[PDB]
Design a protein around this nucleic acid. Structure first.
Ligand code: MG
Ligand code: MG
Ligand code: MG
Ligand code: MG
Ligand code: MG
Ligand code: MG
Ligand code: MG
Ligand code: MG
Ligand code: MG
Ligand code: MG
Ligand code: MG
Ligand code: MG
Ligand code: MG
Ligand code: MG
Ligand code: MG
Ligand code: MG
Ligand code: MG
Ligand code: MG
Ligand code: MG
Ligand code: MG
Ligand code: MG
Ligand code: MG
Ligand code: MG
Ligand code: MG
Ligand code: MG
Ligand code: MG
Ligand code: MG
Ligand code: MG
Ligand code: MG
Ligand code: MG
Ligand code: MG
Ligand code: MG
Ligand code: MG
Ligand code: MG
Ligand code: MG
Ligand code: MG
Ligand code: MG
Ligand code: MG
Ligand code: MG
Ligand code: MG
Ligand code: MG
Ligand code: MG
Ligand code: MG
Ligand code: MG
Ligand code: MG
Ligand code: MG
Ligand code: MG
Ligand code: MG
Ligand code: MG
Ligand code: MG
Ligand code: MG
Ligand code: MG
Ligand code: MG
Ligand code: MG
Ligand code: MG
Ligand code: MG
Ligand code: MG
Ligand code: MG
Ligand code: MG
Ligand code: MG
Ligand code: MG
Ligand code: MG
Ligand code: MG
Ligand code: MG
Ligand code: MG
Ligand code: MG
Ligand code: MG
Ligand code: MG
Ligand code: MG
Ligand code: MG
Ligand code: MG
Ligand code: MG
Ligand code: MG
Ligand code: MG
Ligand code: MG
Ligand code: MG
Ligand code: MG
Ligand code: MG
Ligand code: MG
Ligand code: MG
Ligand code: MG
Ligand code: MG
Ligand code: MG
Ligand code: ZN
Lengths: 239, 83, 52, 50
RNA sequence: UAGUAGCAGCGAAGAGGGGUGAGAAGCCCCUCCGCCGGAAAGGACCAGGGUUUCCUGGCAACUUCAAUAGGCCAGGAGUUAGCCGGUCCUAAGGCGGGGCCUAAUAGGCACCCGCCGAAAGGGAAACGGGUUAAUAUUCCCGUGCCGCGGGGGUAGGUUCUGCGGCAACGCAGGCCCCGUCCCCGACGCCUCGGGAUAGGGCGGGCGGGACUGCCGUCCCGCUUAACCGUCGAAGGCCGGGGAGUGCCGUAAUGGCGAGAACCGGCCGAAGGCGGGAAUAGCCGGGGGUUUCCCCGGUCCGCCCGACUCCUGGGGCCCGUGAAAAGGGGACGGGGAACGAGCCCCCGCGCCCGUACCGAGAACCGACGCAGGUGCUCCUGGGUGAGAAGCCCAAGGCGGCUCGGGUGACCCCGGGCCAGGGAACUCGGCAAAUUGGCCCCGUAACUUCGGGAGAAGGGGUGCCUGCGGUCUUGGGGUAUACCCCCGGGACCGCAGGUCGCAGUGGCAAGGGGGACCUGACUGUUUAACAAAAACAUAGGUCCCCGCGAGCCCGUAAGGGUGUGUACGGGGGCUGAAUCCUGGCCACUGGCGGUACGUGAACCCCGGGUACAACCGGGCGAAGCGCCGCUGAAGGCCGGGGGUAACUGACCCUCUUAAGGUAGCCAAAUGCCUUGCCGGGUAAGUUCCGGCGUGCAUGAAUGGAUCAACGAGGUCCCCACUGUCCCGGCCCGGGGCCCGGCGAACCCACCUCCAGGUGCACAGUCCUGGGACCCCCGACGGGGCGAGAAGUCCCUAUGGAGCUUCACAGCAGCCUGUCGUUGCGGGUCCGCUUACCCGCCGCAAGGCGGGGACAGCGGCAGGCGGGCUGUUCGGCUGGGGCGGCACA
RNA sequence: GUGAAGCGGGGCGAAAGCCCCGUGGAGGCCCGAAGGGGUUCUGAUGUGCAAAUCGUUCCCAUGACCUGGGGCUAGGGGCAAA
RNA sequence: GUGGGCUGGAAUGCCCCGCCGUAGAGGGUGAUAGCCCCGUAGGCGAAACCGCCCGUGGCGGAGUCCCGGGGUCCCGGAGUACCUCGGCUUAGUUUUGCCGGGGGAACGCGCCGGCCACUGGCCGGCAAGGCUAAGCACGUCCCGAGUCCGAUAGCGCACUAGUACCGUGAGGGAAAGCUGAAAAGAACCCCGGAAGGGGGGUGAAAAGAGCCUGAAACCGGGCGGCUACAGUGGGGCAGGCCCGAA
RNA sequence: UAGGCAAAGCCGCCCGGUGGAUGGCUCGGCUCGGGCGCCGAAGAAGGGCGUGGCAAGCUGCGAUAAGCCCGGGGUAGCCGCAGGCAGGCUUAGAACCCGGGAUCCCCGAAUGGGGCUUCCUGCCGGGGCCGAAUAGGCCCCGGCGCCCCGUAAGGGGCGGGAACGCGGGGAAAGGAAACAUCUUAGUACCCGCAGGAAGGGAAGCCAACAGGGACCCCCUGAGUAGGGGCGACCGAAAGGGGGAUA
């Protein structure tokens, strides 16, 4: 037809969907975990970016968390406000001291954790405003945000860091990783297309496109989408 | 039947009958033996080859039997005795 | 290959079976309705005014 | 097929029963007017869509 | 047309005798000949087909010929299950109801509930022999198994608990009901050790068969199901022991006070063996007669050994290789006086499938079709690296459903060819060469891995002996070594000897140098393009902190997301290495103080007994304006003169700047066979240089070739029928005979010359010729046939794509009306509205935001994302031009 | 067939340290059957065996590999290493 | 009327002679029939089921009915009327109806309409609730008619046609009528392996089940003309051979 | 020289073979007019399968299966299309026609639950069978859809039908000699909902100072007013005459 690939992605086809049946479950904090727990397993999850620890609470509730680097099987973790700020412990942001490296941070209490969930990532506890029950934290991107002090986080940094430094040496390796992730692999460049299939397709000497405005409709909003700038000058202006 | 035998789920056993013929019998593979709930290793006294379900197996004469091994049971008993 | 060589692959598959309600070879086994009378997706009989 | 469902088997049985030319006494009764039957077929030529 | 084409090609084929019969090359039987034999071919079987299966009879029609034959026609018959499958479970997923959405439904689905979803996944339990024309784990005989239920005996129990062992753990381990937990179910790929079995072989024995020129060899049978019991390799574990001058090892990695050596013990495969069971089956020898009875044998000692079965060790993953039913155990609560997982005995197991093909004739392709589906799974001996090829078993076939004669040309496929050796030709196209294994040896360059089988050279048969390294059993003091005996594997030495030729058939790389190009493996236009195109790893930029960004939906809502910046989405570049220059003028994007402009709403004035109506004010985004941005799309000239082409000078124009590093007559250079070298006797191609380069140049990627290449090109050696130049031969078409028996094409049908004519006549004119008929061949003519020319133009004909065309519509942004409530002084606060997430079946609770947001209406902006259209005419054909268009 | 990491021995040094051999079994590695694909002859055929075939010559052949059954995506829409 | 004769296989035809007719609409019967038969004009008819009309019958209501006066008190239909914006529609045009967004009445002393709005007069009415027979559309079906077609026509189908069949499917879809009055459907003999052929029969006629008639193209045979030294078809004239019954 | 005298071949007539035209025929079609008009949970229409002594298709019927019972008409033949071979039924009144009943497999709104095979399967109650048994198992029959009304009992909707009717959503081709407003056209088509008809119907009317008097349908007003790139083209109403009358 004429609808482009980014428009076809939103339909939810099998080649664009995530095979989450390959995973044991969501890696989130259950709503009402408290007390001491035991690290029983550290497992690989297909398509995820870090090893996943299985924590067995003292009252029998078991949940999945991202494993802190240095966490080991048989370890005893503490959950709750009374938990000390040691590695693997799940503490409120309000109780966590400043300068602490946490991960799996909850923006609001009870969502399960949103930020610093990739391997080798972490958030830094910058400050505490207890009079509005907020915690200022720096996310992995360098952005400083306020989060609910009653929310929960884990002390330490996410294990599995350095996974992306090693090159994906063959196309087959990225193929096998894509089959576990949700990516459609591989991707055709826009200018390698014909004009019916992409705005960049067409001419005898095919060319890319200049940036489109932020108000551009779907099917037109490809390439640079309302970019502040492009290239090395843009990076320089950013820094 | 025939695609079920082309799949490798059953064992292909060649046998010579008293009539002098050679035939292929398709037999089930053995079921896995019970494992310890902590270590995952096979439990002693219960690792005989079993080929079908519904066969009652006799557990070793110990508390918790074919659930945990003697090592886990003894260590847990020591911890509970102190605790 | 699209002609005679591809015709040989139409020897073992099927899209439709006989419909229990109308008896035609029009019951879509995967979609689970009849393409002629609409049984399985419409309790009223499927018949359109554009068809003679 | 080796493995059949009963409904398909019964429809095949109906086709087997109907597949036959009219009897010779029927031909004599009709004075050679009724010679063929519409339900007559060959398995290789005309295919049931069972 | 025409009794013409075809009934050849794809590596099988028939012949003699007899019988039946009207009729026999073709049907039936024997003999001979041949083909397959990890299979266009033997065994099994899925889907699909559906009676094609079996028997009897037949030849009007069918089978590319025949027919007494048949997948054909007519008549009749045939498919037997507790244990083989479905049936059960869940997967990816789907359907229904409730609900929510919708003008509405037969449309949608995030929610709740139920169900469906595998004849290759998980998963109860059957095997051997015999029997029919046709079913055979289904029928019969024999021997068993599973589930459910019952009876008797027993161990056990009867307030309470089973017994033994240091332990691993062992042993009949009472009964009923309920709960919970755990485990099995339940899992990849690669690699190497060990153990078996199926199968195969060797020597001897018995029995039977094959051959008769010589020898006496060669072949066949000698089998053992499920089920019961017992044993148990690796591995794991228990007790003793208490080790560092270490000690113990493997195919390999290796192990030990975090407990080794060593001793004893426990759990524990395939499979073995006994029972089953010789009474079966088989080989041989007899008797009877409708398949029954009798007799003998069914053995001894070794060897190989799987792709089948079992087991353990090691390694790899930015890849981690399903779920549930069902089952087992344990841990607890409750109940009775009875009572088992042990032994004996009794009873029940419904429903559907079950024939046959499973394909060079049973499926699909109009066909009894060289295709496709399915070679999907399995297969003995020799040679051999081999599941290669060649030959032969078991088993099957001569039905890729025309036969005979002839031995012209010509065509298709194959063989050889003296001297020369690419002179052929666009081009070494085609063909030829090489070819296995062992030994020697191996360059530039390189990303240090490679290049590499580089290149180049030598050996290769058979026979007679002499040895070695292991392996597998048995016997010797004898577990390794040692000696003897039987079997197996591989390696070597000496001598002799034949040929033209010893990887003798089969099988089986030609090699080297250089340029361009794409890093590589991979993908692509099913049916004219396999590529330098796409992808790729790597690089880089942008939108995004999640109530995000992007996308889908009318909406309810959905995907990315069981996710979270080491992430999702969107562009460009395209391995690595050295690098990636100047420019924000334009086209975009984004940010902004002020100012102009800027729609609806609202406000003010006039008007109107009220309005319409008119004027003004306020004025959002946006535009104007100001900045940032080139790994955004991309651009990169000069004018000159001066001056020892200018190192240097002033600049100016300039759409902003004026092409840097590099590279080049390039797959980019018109002129142009550029100029200079090399190569050839002769070189428009090619290579190395030169460069004011029509019109090279930096992630629009520049330079760049190590490796890789069914890429494009030039050269060298070898090789040769490519060619000088043509010849001979082989199989099939061919020709002739018998049988079957079309099509294309066809106004009628045409000897030649020179004219004429809608300008290229069979038919007209003037001439020249021809006895008529038939066969073969060819392809000059019949502007030969096929196809209402795709090339060109016209039409006030289309379609798709583009945008700076004419319009329009979604989408996004912005203002406004409503939702919008309560206080306090346009501003602050509040929560109940509303929204967002968590818990909860629901009821409702928690937290955050908050009259904002979101949502509906209206209004403005951006808006080829999408819809509809228009892109005139004349014309020495159309187009450019011109207007000869008033 | 080649032989990565890892691992043993031998030779040579005062040492730091080099060389030789073996073991080991990595790889979108190499040659090559099945299997998949579709390059040349611009071969045969081209009213065909066939509305895309056949021969020959070829490319990949441990993986981004080939293949069966079940499932999802539908028309201005799908799917697309394009 | 089945009367007499003729023809004929068989008459309904022909010649002669009778009759009915409220019936001469039409069909069948061995050829053309008012009187042979079915029918037609006309008349009679249902155990059962169904429909319509008429008479009669049983019952209920709070006087709700009719006439006369009094009244000036009470009731009398809302997001409606109306205004504004957007849209679809309409002849509806500064003026049709409606839907959506926003605003939004009065009450009988009131409200609505009278082709732009308002004012006054005059005229006509009482929206925003519900029903209603008859008279009118259609054709699966039933009956009748026809300057309709007549087996390539007429419906795709005169017939074992929505059939055989085609496509995965939505869907698509043919060809195909006729013996004779009566089977009297061909006995019997010879040949043939058989289909079948000859002879011989039935029939008015082979009309022979491959069945009424039976054209042309086409093919075979007979006949007439030409036919191997002469280039073709059409016309006119002359001639050779052949036919020249009506 | 010519004839006897002829090859292959050509022309014309006759006969034959092929073929199925022509003509004649008609239990078929088509048009028009009139009537009549709903069926379904009491399980419909539609489909599958089956059903005949020899029976393949059509027709009919439904395991009681070209059929069973009752009544009326119809008397002597009958066993459909369909002309064969048998054997039967019927005068104790058949066949046949009309009215009323019985039977009425599986699927189908399909309705216990499923349905990738028109078949499979669950729970409850009753019954039967195997069995030593009262266990266990198997089989038969009945009930078990969703949404509603109702106190309950009980009831309603669902699907179908050639066309016609009502409400909603709603194009383009073509025309305008291009084309967008426009038209085509509120059409084709889609969704929903009824009846034998539907819809409409009883003045907040029309008129114009004279008066009509619910509604629908027909003739007219009339291609008039009016709408409209005022182009193509579109297009009333009041009034009058009728059908009918509430
Ligand atoms: Mg995917
Ligand atoms: Mg392209
Ligand atoms: Mg664009
Ligand atoms: Mg576009
Ligand atoms: Mg472009
Ligand atoms: Mg299975
Ligand atoms: Mg398994
Ligand atoms: Mg196609
Ligand atoms: Mg399918
Ligand atoms: Mg077929
Ligand atoms: Mg011949
Ligand atoms: Mg020939
Ligand atoms: Mg051979
Ligand atoms: Mg052979
Ligand atoms: Mg085979
Ligand atoms: Mg047969
Ligand atoms: Mg036979
Ligand atoms: Mg047959
Ligand atoms: Mg199921
Ligand atoms: Mg058989
Ligand atoms: Mg032997
Ligand atoms: Mg080894
Ligand atoms: Mg069988
Ligand atoms: Mg064949
Ligand atoms: Mg072989
Ligand atoms: Mg053999
Ligand atoms: Mg042959
Ligand atoms: Mg021949
Ligand atoms: Mg030569
Ligand atoms: Mg040359
Ligand atoms: Mg030359
Ligand atoms: Mg070549
Ligand atoms: Mg060879
Ligand atoms: Mg490449
Ligand atoms: Mg490649
Ligand atoms: Mg192609
Ligand atoms: Mg090609
Ligand atoms: Mg590329
Ligand atoms: Mg790079
Ligand atoms: Mg760029
Ligand atoms: Mg640049
Ligand atoms: Mg330069
Ligand atoms: Mg060049
Ligand atoms: Mg240059
Ligand atoms: Mg340039
Ligand atoms: Mg470029
Ligand atoms: Mg450039
Ligand atoms: Mg580059
Ligand atoms: Mg270069
Ligand atoms: Mg001329
Ligand atoms: Mg001519
Ligand atoms: Mg033309
Ligand atoms: Mg054309
Ligand atoms: Mg063109
Ligand atoms: Mg014109
Ligand atoms: Mg189009
Ligand atoms: Mg707001
Ligand atoms: Mg809004
Ligand atoms: Mg457009
Ligand atoms: Mg114009
Ligand atoms: Mg022009
Ligand atoms: Mg011009
Ligand atoms: Mg490889
Ligand atoms: Mg070519
Ligand atoms: Mg060719
Ligand atoms: Mg040819
Ligand atoms: Mg290879
Ligand atoms: Mg009479
Ligand atoms: Mg009122
Ligand atoms: Mg006719
Ligand atoms: Mg017709
Ligand atoms: Mg005739
Ligand atoms: Mg005369
Ligand atoms: Mg002659
Ligand atoms: Mg019915
Ligand atoms: Mg049902
Ligand atoms: Mg209805
Ligand atoms: Mg029209
Ligand atoms: Mg027009
Ligand atoms: Mg047009
Ligand atoms: Mg009415
Ligand atoms: Mg009504
Ligand atoms: Mg209109
Ligand atoms: Zn149906």
């Amino acid at each position: 037809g004429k609808r482009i690939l980014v428009q076809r992605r939103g339909r939810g086809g099998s080649q664009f969907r995530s095979p989450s049946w390959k995973r044991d479950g969501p890696v989130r904090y259950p709503p009402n975990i408290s007390g001491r727990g035991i690290v029983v397993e550290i497992l690989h999850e297909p398509g995820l970016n870090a090893p996943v620890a299985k924590i067995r609470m003292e009252n029998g509730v078991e949940f999945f968390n991202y494993a802190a680097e240095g966490l080991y099987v048989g370890q005893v973790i503490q959950v709750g406000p009374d938990a000390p700020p040691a590695v693997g412990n799940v503490l409120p942001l309000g109780k966590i001291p400043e300068g602490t490296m946490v991960f799996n941070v909850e923006k609001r209490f009870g969502d399960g954790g949103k930020f610093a969930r990739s391997g080798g990532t972490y958030a830094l506890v910058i400050g505490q405003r207890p009079e509005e029950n907020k915690t200022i934290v720096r996310l992995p991107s360098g952005r400083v945000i306020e989060v609910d002090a009653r929310g929960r986080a884990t002390i330490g940094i996410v294990a599995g860091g350095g996974r992306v430094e090693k090159p994906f040496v063959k196309a087959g390796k990225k193929y096998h990783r894509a089959r576990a992730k949700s990516w459609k692999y591989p991707t055709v460049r826009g200018k390698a297309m014909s004009p019916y299939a992409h705005p960049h397709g067409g001419g005898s000497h095919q060319k890319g496109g200049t940036p489109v405005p932020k108000t551009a409709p779907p099917g037109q909003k490809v390439g640079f989408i309302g970019s502040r700038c492009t290239g090395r000058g843009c990076v320089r202006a950013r820094a | 039947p025939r695609p079920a035998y082309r799949s490798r789920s059953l064992r292909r056993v060649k046998v010579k009958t008293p009539g002098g013929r050679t035939v292929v019998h398709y037999e089930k593979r053995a079921k896995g033996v019970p494992k310890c709930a902590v270590t995952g290793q096979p439990l002693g006294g219960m690792n005989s080859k079993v080929y079908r379900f519904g066969i009652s197996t006799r557990a070793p004469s110990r508390p918790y039997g074919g659930v945990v091994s003697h090592k886990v049971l003894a260590r847990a008993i020591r911890y509970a005795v102190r605790r | 290959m699209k002609g005679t060589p591809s015709m040989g692959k139409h020897n073992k598959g099927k899209t439709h079976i006989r419909c229990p309600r109308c008896g035609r070879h029009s019951y879509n086994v995967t979609k689970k309705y009849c393409a002629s009378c609409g049984w399985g997706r419409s309790k009223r009989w499927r018949r359109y005014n554009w068809a003679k | 097929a080796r493995n059949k469902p009963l409904g398909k088997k019964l429809r095949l049985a109906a086709a087997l029963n109907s597949n036959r030319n009219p009897p010779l006494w029927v031909i004599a009764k009709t004075k050679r007017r009724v010679t063929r039957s519409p339900a007559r077929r060959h398995w290789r030529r005309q295919k049931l869509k069972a």
